[PDB]
Amino acid sequence: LAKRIDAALIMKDGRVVKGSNFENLRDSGDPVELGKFYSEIGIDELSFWDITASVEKRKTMLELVEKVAEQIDIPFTVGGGIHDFETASELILRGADKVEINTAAVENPSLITQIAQTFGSQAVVVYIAAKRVDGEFMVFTYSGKKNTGILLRDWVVEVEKRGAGEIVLGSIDRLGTKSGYDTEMIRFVRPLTTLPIIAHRGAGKMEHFLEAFLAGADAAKADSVFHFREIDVRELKEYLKKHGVNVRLE
Ligand SMILES: N#Cc1cc([N+](=O)[O-])ccc1O
Incomplete structure (x- = not known):
């Protein structure tokens, strides 16, 4: 298959841990808005990795998945402390394509x-x-x-x-x-x-x-290089295609 470029978002309590530098966003720490943007500029898949506290974690991860699945139209995974089948199942059914x-x-x-x-x-x-x-x-x-x-x-x-x-x-x-x-x-x-x-x-x-x-x-897969804008996603994809890698462009 084509090579895939994945953006990983580390989160806690529904926030992107350490946000991002995309000034054009209403909330650069909002995972849905950030992930939607990535999906528009050429990310192929999103991975969300959650580290919220035990009490609120399960409900927080389900809400994230639910909110992501509404607005985003590329495949996405969810992970972070998935310990059993019932936890994985409820996240997939709520909208994730894969679990990590x-x-x-x-x-x-x-x-x-x-x-x-x-x-x-x-x-x-x-x-x-x-x-x-x-x-x-x-x-x-x-x-x-x-x-x-x-x-x-x-x-x-x-x-x-x-x-x-x-x-x-x-x-x-x-x-x-x-x-x-x-x-x-x-x-x-x-x-x-x-x-x-x-x-x-x-x-x-x-x-x-x-x-x-x-x-x-x-x-x-990468995270901070994209969030802090050390690498631009569309520049990356153009670069890889130039040098013979089968990536997807618009
Ligand atoms: N994907 C992934 C991932 C995994 C870990 N991890 O197994 O600590 C941490 C951050 C991550 O973005």
Whole structure:
């Protein structure tokens, strides 16, 4: 398929954490208005990742999904503390196209299969946060706090066997950097799975998107580079098409 450009919005209490620099918006911290804008300038998919407090979280995530589904017409995912099938199901039914799961899937891989049984593999995105430890790629849970001791190589294979539709490869080694996506990590995973690979963490300039697609990613996800306008989405898409990448333009 065409390569995909994804914008991720981190949220809390219904607000975009740290907003954005788009002065043309009524509320640059409103996820619906920001995501609608991205959908108009060439983002292919939106991912919303929620970190609100336990009490208000479930109702907050459902309201977000509901509000997004009304105004936005591109596919979108939702994630952040989705721990079980009933939570994932109610978010998809309320309007999300896919859910992103990480820690809960590592602790119970059958959760992938559960969700896929009812909603299809295409509704299940497994986010894999990985880091080099003593020379080997290991899987981390709990927002990067826990080395599971599971090898990336092994978790990828299991994720596909259990029925996931896509994998996000979040390189903890690149969090908060602008040096590029972890293309070595992407290239290590690419031969192990037939699933779409989404690159995450490290992007700082448009060239990094090209590098990740050459490494074998099928989609590239980023957030702050777009929200703080270090990279313009339509410039990025024109750049990638110029250099031979099959992306979608208007
Ligand atoms: N997608 C995604 C995503 C995942 C995590 N995470 O597994 O901490 C954090 C932020 C994100 O945007």
